[PDB]
Scaffold this active site. Structure first.
Site: not given
Lengths: 195, 222, 204, 212, 229, 244, 242, 240, 233
Positions: D1, D49
């Site tokens: 990420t 998310a």
């Protein structure tokens, strides 16, 4: 980090603020104003809790600027400090608490006398000759009471603040990377660019 | 202390074709070590060549098939039988999911159909809310046993033409529906032998241009 | 640490002969750090007096509050509120914020103007009316004060001799407490005039 | 990420990874962490998310509804201060947000804004959010200049994600680049992170350390 | 949060060729203290469905009332379908399910398990399960609470799969359940000698045998166990 | 059905006027007269009761003069009951500003908010407009002495003198002659009794048909004083201008 | 006063009859839908040479493939444009797809129905009206270019072409002759101006006219005031050949 | 509770109350607006003429909304106070959420918005107010003048007039303000705005108030002396 | 037309009458004709679709409520939109909760009960539209008549609209014939044409202005239009 310091000399309020803003492991930026102009002769600095500081700044700022449209009359610094203490007082009881400390430095034209107000997050106002917040405000109180005289002009006051930061760099472990210093003189609100 | 999330085991497997798609999963429904029913559909048709399965905690899974077939209905009255696109359907669940984000559903949902272009389409939804269009994704309890076999037999991932020593990646060749039926059957034969929440039965729904074809294949009863 | 012990300060109030005297220390800081020796804790409404100790944010909020209630009283009757119906006003507003109470202790001391009558009363959190006709103490060294007062205090003292008395008891207790130490104000209140004298208090 | 974005001459480079893990298990390696809010704003996906994808589509809606309403396109600074003040409402409900909204308008120039869950909203020239927030800073900041060729700026983005992807567990997958001009973002496409490593190891001659 | 106080426990069931056989014990326990006895909890709903309820007693009586009114709602009007459209098993079930959904949203559940067992107007055998969890599943045989670990293996001799339902007659089924009961009465603390048996046959209605007791008990072997070494 | 019974206070006439509002301006001119006079050196607020009977306890009553806070006094014209609502609603609003700025409400503000309340009754909600008009007399640092009047429409204007109640045109022309801009407080007192002694419908002007109050900056140390005179000091200055 | 509630013993809600008058008062609005480009043109009716022509808006964008022209009181319409804008964007969040043109009309028609007594807590946020028509024009895959006519009735029909406003009667009779199924974009654009010239109070100029289309590639696009001045100029050449 | 319908449609295609609205405006004061090419000028006549009536503390009929927006209003003056209030509210809630001061375009919609929305609800009569809105777009030089109706309609104008005897001054403006050539300077515009008022004011300089807004939050009023000077100038020239 | 009573549904007349209801009843006869007839395996609706002028398209007169049920409007088109929603809504409510086909019998009675509320309360107009609800369930085939008044009755055959009696009379002469028609889909539609031609008096029969709907024991609710009704006619 959290360092907002205030010193009132004979003809000015000098508020100085930390250049740095740390969220997370990194130092995200090293420049970010931690002050908003309310009025032409009223300046507010704020430090504290991630993210509340912004919302509680610009909520005050609009509201106080609303009054100035309505009545065409810049509020006393005396007045301004009250409005904020009221908003804080109310907010501690609520569902959201507001962790925010404010120094309000302004130039009264009614009295023609600088005034500085110190508000803690609880909701207690106290007018001071100089003040601070956090654990950080400790290192500064003891230089100030040695060398403060109640007569200094803007240049003697500016040098004094330089000593204070100079100490703060030695002893504290959180960095902050210098200060932006801002001066509320007889009328003006000017950023001095030097340390 | 009341806990309103269970588990009911079970596993689905979505393989996209080049004009077909496949949503398969097992018929075994369980709770800890007691077998409730050996046979119990999971993979329900929603008409219009959408097939959906919301696998995981069976209690949520029916509630998120409720509101879904409800909304499939109520699109068709107000747009006067504009056919519901596999793609649009995606973005819809994503609202139903997110709508209970402060009381989640523990299900891992996959919808699948043909898109306008005629290509297969597999989507799979994060149980919290978001989603990403895939080519293949397992979910359900023995997800982590089935996925890594499919990526070596479909994408030829980490295989190379022999003699060329790493310099030539083996080429992608699009799979026939005859081929992809066999792939599923092998996957869910092995899943049984090493995981204790697969077995008894497998249900494939195959969706093409024609419509929906059903195929039931037995597995080991243990 | 409780909320009352953050901001500290003490308030003592002692009756005399046809007179009364209220006094506090001027400290206003948190934990170890001192902020100011300018903070005043004693307010007044008419010829009645009001002192308050404890949580600093509730201090100024109950001052703005009572000022508003005793404004709206003075306009309707057109006179000063009597000390006894001020007592009452205090009780009700503590007690209706029963939950989330204001962390204070109000000390009321005044002279009912009509009767010449020396008058004191005490409070605490959710509002118990401490009647006394000897003396009241509050704040974060209330054990310490209690001693000194009880031995020194005699009933009937001249407005001039009262001033010696309350002097002693405030000074010695403040420097035997951690949370009081800067300065000190005493109001001697005779039926017609109000003397303000700041004590020389040794630095903390 | 790893999500990073730097201001440079010709505009903005966005760059992201695509390995999105769920636990130890690696869920999927195809997750495009850009969210096209319209053809002149690009918004990244880092943090949780669900909270991120959904809520910047909803931002997409206030863009097609500010745009009709005044007939003037949304400023980049103003877009951000929408999104921020919405998630401030829900503060303390575990929603998880780390996006950069990137745009270039002709009234403000290329400007990144970084919206964060506390309500902190910062302008700045470099931001990088997520697992690869410290590795990415480091490679990037040596080689970073306010003056640069657009081509070089694309190659500076590759190398920044590359570096975080090697050392970090949850960064991997594929890299993505976008190049914001005034006219809109154009996609400069997807390079595999396993082909990309071996070109740059040999060609440049770095990563000596790595075997092979 | 609800705390099961007065609970009764266990309900068994299986299909055969012409209907279903559901039977449950009758016994209201209160921890160790067996505080109420012979508490009916086989409820007839019309004459072609029995609903057998288990777990908490208090919660049960509040699902005995919602059934009763459910018939009064349906019976209104439909005069040329007061026996043609009268509450199918399949109706009675869905309704319960979706109430049990709705209390689990507020996290104040009716803390029970429900079996709905009946016969359709096709003659189709019907047997479903719902419980606090909000799971449903239908099945060739079914057991609740503690009989999922003892009773289920016994009935799964008779009914294995869908090849065996026409071969299984109602004489055989009958024997099987009674006998199944023997084993529950042995190995379960919260179980007594009294049990109520219902046959819903698709060709003769609701046969309701009440207050049968267990038969043929082996306890001769027990004299011969001595110490433990 | 019920629409028939509905008066429609709200509606505009074919004049575009609010006929209801014009009626209300009437009900003021029935009531006793009140006169405003601005001086440089103070404000004399002077109004002659409408009541008159010989059993009225004049000492006990105020009914035409109310204090708002310590700097601001109003004189009332109309129905006293109506007024009393507004006058409490004022008093609370004054205080609300004091808690929030520790700075007494400027006179412009306080008037503006009363005026907003009144207007609202005749915007919406089919209420009957209040039958009231106030003279506002008040002092601050900003502008000095300020005088205003607000009428039942909800529209206010400032003034250097003004009169409300009966004989409004009569009063206004007497003041137009006589007021010079320079007056002291003592001369201003004498112009107020003069203007009230002609217009009075009753034959004699008596100390118990009058109410007089002052607002003076001749209180030392830069402080303002109000004072409502007793009925026994208005008697001493009734012989001073020779009315008796 | 008539109720909104009451019936006229003919069977009619007096209020609907009065609404459909308000259309006719307002300014002319022509629409001609062909199989190659819907053209909407309206007469602005600038009321003084002081007033600036282009501040006035009566061609309005609902989204980027549904354009809309309004006739009647432009105020009443301010509420109903905003409602329509939201709903079309709501659908584009919810299905990532162009709202059907027909569907959008229905939602407008639904708000139009509202004018009710506002009994109990029920939300009817109007008590009156909506005296305006729309020429809702659009393009979608399902049916080609369409064009729909909304009323304040809550009643809408599809139309190959429809005039409305002051000169509706005259424009209607020329349309039943001239309309055809073979029109091009370039012929329809010139034909709209010719029918709009007859019932224009003033001489045909672009300082009291505004033209627009919606064409498949472009979407919505209102024309430039420079383009329009040129199409005026070309009409008079063809006419002066005759 | 009260929601009785006040927009009873007129069978002649109108609404009785919205005609009456337009009538009440005509009753009240006059005010004129003209836009040069670098200034706007709002003049209004004041019947606040009346010996012994202050003007220091009496509120003028031209109001400040924001730093660079100004409003002038004709019609009921009780009512004016509301639309000021709402607009001020707006002006800040725009800064708060989108940044940047109000575009003059936007604020026009928004005031217009409020007046329409009083014909929708039954419990409320229409505002019988028309307004002139003026200002200069943030960080620009573009004069703008807008006027709204108690219908709720709005349009920009080169110059406009609302209030009593608007026909005299419109007829004057057609001849004397060219649409292609604005008055060049600030003094030439102001001379032109005075000359328009001095038709219906019947001389005097004490009556009329002239405020000018220029770009960069320049809100200034002309004081009695200046007014007199301009008037006198127009006197000599005209006489000659 | 006033005097006497014509205000709210509250005011009740010394005659025994309630005027507003009767007014509402006049409303249906304004709209275009609709017939409805059944047999035991099929229920058909025929309605006349209409257009404002000849550039205008026709109007949708038949509404599919569900895959086993549907209505057709006669009279007010805004009113029909409110009540068609509420029968979508309610037949959804019985598939969600109880999983039962909403029985035609029940669905009539619920609509009756909603209409009543509008005539008891102050304000609210009576609904002024008429619905012929056809539908097929396990009780065979039904046809219902919704009057504005609130009454529902089941009929073999009816019409309501403009010059309806011409269709109502035909339906009674042949009552004996069309119930005995079972199984021929074609024969049922074609009887219903010859029942609606009588109403067309001063009206020509177009084939694209006619709307036809069959529902039966094996076909769902289906509207025919365009090419499909050009087979039959």
């Amino acid at each position: 980090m959290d360092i907002i310091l205030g010193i009132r000399v004979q003809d000015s309020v000098i508020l100085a603020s930390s250049k740095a803003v740390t969220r997370g492991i990194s130092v995200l930026k090293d420049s970010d104003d931690k002050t908003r102009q309310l009025s032409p002769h009223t300046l507010m600095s704020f430090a504290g809790e991630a993210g509340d500081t912004v919302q509680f700044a610009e909520y005050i700022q609009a509201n106080i600027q609303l009054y100035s449209i309505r009545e065409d009359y810049e509020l006393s610094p005396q007045a301004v400090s009250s409005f904020v203490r009221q908003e804080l007082a109310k907010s501690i009881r609520s569902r959201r608490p507001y962790q925010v400390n404010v120094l309000i430095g302004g130039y009264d034209k009614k009295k023609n006398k600088p005034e500085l107000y110190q508000i803690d997050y609880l909701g207690t106002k106290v007018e001071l000759p100089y003040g601070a917040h956090g654990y950080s405000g400790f290192y500064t109180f003891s230089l100030l009471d040695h060398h403060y005289r109640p007569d200094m002009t803007t240049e003697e006051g500016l040098d004094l603040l330089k000593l204070c930061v100079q100490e703060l760099e030695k002893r504290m472990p959180m960095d902050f990377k210098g200060v932006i210093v801002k001066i509320v003189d007889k009328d003006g609100i000017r950023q001095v660019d030097d340390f | 202390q009341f806990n309103p999330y269970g588990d009911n085991g079970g596993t689905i497997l979505g393989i996209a074709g080049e004009d077909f798609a496949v949503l398969a999963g097992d018929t075994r429904n369980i709770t800890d070590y007691s077998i409730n029913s050996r046979y119990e559909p999971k993979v329900f048709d929603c008409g219009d060549n959408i097939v959906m399965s919301a696998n995981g905690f069976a209690a949520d899974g029916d509630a998120l098939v409720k509101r879904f077939k409800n909304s499939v209905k109520w699109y068709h009255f107000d747009h006067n039988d504009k056919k519901l696109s596999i793609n649009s359907a995606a973005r819809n669940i994503q609202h139903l999911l997110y709508g209970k984000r402060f009381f989640p559903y523990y299900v891992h949902t996959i919808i699948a159909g043909l898109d306008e272009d005629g290509k297969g389409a597999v989507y799979s939804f994060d149980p919290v809310g978001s989603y990403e269009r895939e080519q293949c994704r397992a979910g359900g309890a023995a997800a982590s046993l089935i996925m890594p076999f499919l990526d070596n037999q479909v994408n030829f991932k980490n295989q190379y033409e022999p003699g060329t020593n790493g310099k030539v990646k083996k080429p992608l060749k699009y799979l026939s529906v005859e081929e992809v039926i066999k792939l599923v059957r092998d996957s869910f034969t092995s899943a049984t032998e090493r995981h204790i929440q697969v077995g008894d039965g497998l249900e494939i729904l195959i969706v093409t241009k024609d419509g929906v074809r059903k195929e039931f294949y037995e597995l080991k009863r243990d | 640490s409780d909320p009352s012990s953050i901001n500290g300060g003490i308030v003592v109030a002692m009756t005399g002969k046809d007179c009364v005297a209220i006094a506090c220390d001027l400290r206003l800081g948190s934990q170890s750090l001192g902020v100011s020796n300018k903070f005043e804790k004693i307010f007044h409404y008419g010829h009645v007096f009001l002192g308050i100790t404890g949580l600093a944010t509730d201090v100024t909020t109950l001052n703005e509050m009572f000022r508003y209630k005793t404004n709206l009283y003075k306009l309707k009757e057109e006179r000063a509120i009597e000390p006894e119906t001020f007592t009452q006003l205090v009780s009700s507003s503590l007690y209706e914020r029963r939950f989330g109470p204001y962390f204070v202790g109000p000390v009321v001391a005044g002279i009912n103007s009509k009767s010449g009558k020396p008058f004191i009363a005490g409070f605490d959190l959710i509002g118990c009316i401490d009647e006394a006709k000897d003396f009241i103490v509050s704040g974060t060294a209330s054990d310490q004060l209690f001693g000194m007062c009880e031995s020194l205090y005699e009933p009937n003292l001249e407005p001039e001799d009262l001033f010696e008395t309350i002097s002693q008891a405030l000074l010695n207790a403040a420097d035997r407490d951690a949370l009081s130490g800067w300065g000190a104000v005493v109001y001697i209140i005779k039926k017609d005039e109000v003397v303000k004298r700041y004590l020389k208090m040794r630095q903390d | 990420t790893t999500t990073l974005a730097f201001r440079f001459q010709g505009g903005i480079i966005v760059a992201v990874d695509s390995r999105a893990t769920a636990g130890n298990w690696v869920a999927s390696q195809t997750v495009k962490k850009v969210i096209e809010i319209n053809p002149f704003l690009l918004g990244t996906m880092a943090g949780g998310a669900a909270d991120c994808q959904f809520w910047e589509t909803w931002l997409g809606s206030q863009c097609r509804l500010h745009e009709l309403r005044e007939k003037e396109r949304i400023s980049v600074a103003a877009a951000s201060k929408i999104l921020s003040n919405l998630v401030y409402q829900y503060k303390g409900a575990g929603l998880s947000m780390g996006t950069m909204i990137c745009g270039y308008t002709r009234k403000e120039g290329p400007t990144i804004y970084y919206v964060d869950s506390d309500g902190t909203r910062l302008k700045g020239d470099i931001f990088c959010v997520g697992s690869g927030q410290t590795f990415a800073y480091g490679v990037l900041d040596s080689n970073y200049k306010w003056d640069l060729s657009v081509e070089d700026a694309l190659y500076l983005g590759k190398r920044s994600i590359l570096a975080a992807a090697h050392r970090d567990a949850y960064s991997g997958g594929s890299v993505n680049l976008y190049h914001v001009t005034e006219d809109g973002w154009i996609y400069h496409g997807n390079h595999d992170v396993g082909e990309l490593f071996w070109k740059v190891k040999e060609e440049e001659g770095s990563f000596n350390n790595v075997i092979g | 949060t609800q705390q099961p106080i007065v609970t009764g426990t266990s309900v068994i069931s299986m299909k055969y060729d012409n209907g279903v056989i559901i039977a449950a014990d009758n016994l209201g326990s209160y921890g160790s203290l067996l505080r109420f006895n012979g508490v009916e909890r086989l409820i007839p709903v019309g004459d072609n469905t029995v609903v057998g309820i288990s777990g908490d007693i208090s919660d049960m009586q509040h699902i005995e009332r919602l059934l009763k009114d459910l018939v009064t709602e349906n019976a209104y009007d439909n005069p040329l379908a007061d026996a043609e459209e009268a509450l199918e098993p399949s109706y009675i079930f869905e309704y319960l399910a979706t109430v049990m959904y709705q209390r689990r949203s507020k996290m104040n559940p009716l803390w029970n398990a429900i079996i709905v067992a009946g016969v359709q107007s096709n003659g189709d055998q019907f047997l479903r399960y719902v419980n606090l969890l909000g799971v449903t599943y239908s099945s060739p045989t079914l057991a609740t609470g503690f009989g999922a670990h003892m009773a289920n293996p016994l009935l799964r001799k008779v009914v294995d799969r869908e090849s065996d339902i026409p071969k299984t007659t109602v004489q055989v089924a009958e024997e099987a359940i009674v006998n199944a009961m023997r084993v529950l009465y042995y190995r379960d603390a919260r179980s007594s000698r009294n049990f109520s048996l219902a046959i819903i046959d698709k060709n003769t209605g609701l046969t309701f045998k009440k207050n049968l007791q267990v038969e043929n008990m082996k306890w001769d072997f027990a004299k011969d166990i001595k110490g433990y070494g | 059905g019920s629409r028939r019974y509905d008066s429609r206070t709200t509606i505009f006439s074919p004049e575009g006027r609010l006929y209801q509002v014009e009626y209300a301006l009437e009900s003021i001119s029935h009531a006793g007269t009140a006169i405003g006079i601005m001086a440089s050196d103070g404000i004399v607020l002077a109004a002659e009761r409408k009541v008159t009977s010989t059993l009225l306890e004049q000492d006990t009553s105020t009914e035409k003069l109310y204090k708002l806070n310590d700097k601001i006094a109003v004189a009332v014209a109309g129905l006293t009951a109506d007024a009393e609502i507004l006058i409490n609603t004022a008093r609370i609003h004054a205080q609300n500003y004091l808690k929030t700025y520790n700075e007494d409400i400027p006179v412009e503000i306080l008037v503006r908010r009363l005026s907003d309340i009144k207007q609202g009754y005749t915007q919406h909600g089919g209420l009957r407009p209040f039958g009231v008009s106030f003279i506002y007399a008040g002092y601050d640092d900003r502008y000095g002495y300020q005088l205003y009047t607000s009428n039942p429409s909800g529209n206010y204007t400032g003034w250097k003198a003004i009169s409300v109640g009966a004989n409004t045109s009569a009063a206004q022309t007497l003041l137009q002659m006589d007021y010079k801009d320079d007056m002291k407080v003592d001369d201003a007192i004498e112009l107020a009794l003069k203007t009230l002694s002609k217009t009075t419908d009753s034959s004699a002007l008596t100390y118990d048909r009058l109410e007089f109050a002052t607002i003076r900056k001749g209180a030392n140390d830069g402080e303002v004083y109000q004072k409502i005179f007793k009925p026994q000091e208005i008697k001493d200055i009734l012989v001073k201008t020779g009315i008796t | 006063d008539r109720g909104v509630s009451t019936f006229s013993p003919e069977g009619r809600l007096f209020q609907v009859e009065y609404s459909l008058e308000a259309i006719k008062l307002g300014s002319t609005a022509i629409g001609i839908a062909t199989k190659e480009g819907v053209v909407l043109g309206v007469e602005k009716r600038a009321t003084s040479p002081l007033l600036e022509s282009d501040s006035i808006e009566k061609i309005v964008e609902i989204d980027r493939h549904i354009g809309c022209a309004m006739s009647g009181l432009t105020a009443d319409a301010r509420s109903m444009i905003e409602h329509a804008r939201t709903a079309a964007v709501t659908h584009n969040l919810y299905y990532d797809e162009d709202i059907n043109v027909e569907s959008l009309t229905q939602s407008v028609c639904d708000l139009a129905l509202r004018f009710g007594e506002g009994a109990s807590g029920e939300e009817r946020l109007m008590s009156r009206p909506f005296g305006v028509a729309l020429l809702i024009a659009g393009h979608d895959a399902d049916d080609g270019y369409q064009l729909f006519h909304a009323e304040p009735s809550g009643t809408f029909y599809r139309y190959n072409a429809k005039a409305i406003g002051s000169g509706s009667e005259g424009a209607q009779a020329e349309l039943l002759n001239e309309w055809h199924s073979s029109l091009t974009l370039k012929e329809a654009e010139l034909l709209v101006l010719k029918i709009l010239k007859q019932v224009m109070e003033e001489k045909l100029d672009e300082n009291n006219a505004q033209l627009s289309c919606i064409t498949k590639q472009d979407g919505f696009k209102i024309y430039d005031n420079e383009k329009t001045a040129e199409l005026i100029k070309e009409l008079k050449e063809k006419e002066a050949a005759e | 509770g009260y929601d009785r319908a006040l927009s009873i449609f007129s069978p002649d295609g109108h609404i009785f109350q919205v005609e009456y609205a337009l009538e009440a405006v005509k009753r009240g004061t006059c005010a004129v607006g003209v836009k040069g090419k670098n200034c706007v000028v709002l003049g209004c006549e004041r019947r606040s003429t009346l010996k012994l009536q202050d003007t220091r503390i009496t509120p003028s009929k031209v109001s400040k909304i924001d730093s660079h927006v100004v409003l002038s209003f004709s019609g009921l003056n009780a009512d004016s106070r509301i639309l000021i209030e709402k607009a001020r509210v707006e002006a800040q809630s725009h800064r708060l959420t989108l940044e940047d001061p109000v575009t003059v375009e936007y604020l026009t919609r928004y005031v217009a918005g409020v007046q329409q929305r009083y014909t929708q609800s039954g419990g409320v009569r229409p505002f019988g107010v028309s307004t002139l809105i003026a200002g200069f777009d943030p960080r620009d030089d573009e004069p703008k003048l807008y006027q709204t109706e108690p219908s709720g309609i709005y349009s920009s104008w080169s110059a406009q007039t609302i209030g009593r005897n608007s026909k005299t001054v419109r007829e004057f403006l057609e001849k004397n303000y060219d649409r292609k050539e604005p008055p060049a300077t600030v003094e030439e515009c102001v001379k032109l705005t005075v000359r328009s008022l001095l038709e219906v004011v019947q001389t005097g300089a004490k009556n009329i108030e002239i405020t000018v807004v220029k770009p960069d939050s320049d809100i200034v009023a002309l004081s009695s002396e200046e007014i007199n000077q301009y008037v006198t100038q127009i006197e000599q020239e005209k006489q000659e | 037309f006033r005097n006497n009573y014509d205000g709210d549904t509250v005011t009740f007349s010394p005659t025994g009458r309630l005027f507003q209801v009767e007014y509402a009843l006049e409303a249906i006869k304004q709209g275009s004709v609709t017939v409805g007839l059944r047999s035991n395996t099929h229920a058909v609706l025929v309605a006349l679709k209409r257009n404002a002028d000849e550039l205008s398209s026709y109007q949708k007169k038949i509404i599919k409520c569900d895959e086993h049920m549907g209505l057709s409007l006669a009279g007010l088109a805004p009113d029909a939109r409110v009540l068609s929603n509420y029968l979508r809504q309610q037949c959804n409510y019985s598939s969600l909760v109880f999983n039962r086909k909403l029985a035609v019998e029940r669905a009539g009675h619920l609509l009756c009960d909603k209409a009543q509320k509008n005539t008891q309360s102050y304000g609210g107009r009576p609904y002024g539209v008429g619905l012929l609800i056809i539908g097929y369930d396990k009780s065979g085939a039904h046809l219902l008549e919704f009057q504005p008044s609130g009454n529902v009755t089941e009929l073999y055959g009816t019409a309501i609209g403009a010059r309806s009696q011409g269709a109502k009379t035909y339906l009674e002469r042949t009552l004996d014939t069309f119930i005995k028609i079972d199984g021929n889909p074609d024969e049922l539609i074609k009887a219903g044409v010859e029942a609606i031609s009588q109403s067309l008096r001063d009206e020509s029969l177009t084939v694209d202005n006619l709307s036809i709907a069959i529902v039966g024991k094996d076909t769902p609710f289906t509207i025919y239009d365009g090419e499909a009704v050009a087979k039959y006619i």
